[PDB]
């Protein structure tokens, strides 16, 4: 199964890289940024 082991190692590398390429952390950071611009745009401070 040594060939199987090497193939599994390569497949694990590919899966980890693919998941890393589509991690939600970047999406969440972008969403927090968007929230920042929305809050600054709609001017809660002036309202208070």
């Amino acid at each position: 199964f040594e060939r199987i082991n090497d193939i599994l190692e390569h497949v694990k590398h590919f899966v980890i890289n693919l998941i890393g390429d589509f991690e939600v952390a970047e999406k969440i950071n972008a969403f927090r940024a968007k929230v920042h611009e929305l809050i600054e745009r709609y001017e809660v401070d002036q309202q208070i």
């Binding site: 980890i16 890393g20 991690e23 952390a25 969440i28 927090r32 809050i39 401070d45 208070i48």
Partner: protein
């Protein structure tokens, strides 16, 4: 009797919009840091 209107005015003054927006800026700082996901930690866990 006189202390009452003075007490109400002092209560209004102490907790004015200044403190409210100070706490709002604290919340926005939390958004800037605490609500962000460190993609670096994500990739470190993936590599581990």
């Amino acid at each position: 009797l006189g202390k009452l209107p003075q007490q109400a005015n002092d209560y209004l003054n102490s907790f004015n919009w200044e403190r409210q927006v100070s706490h709002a800026k604290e919340k926005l700082t939390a958004l800037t840091k605490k609500y962000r996901i460190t993609e670096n930690d994500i990739q470190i866990a993936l590599d581990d």
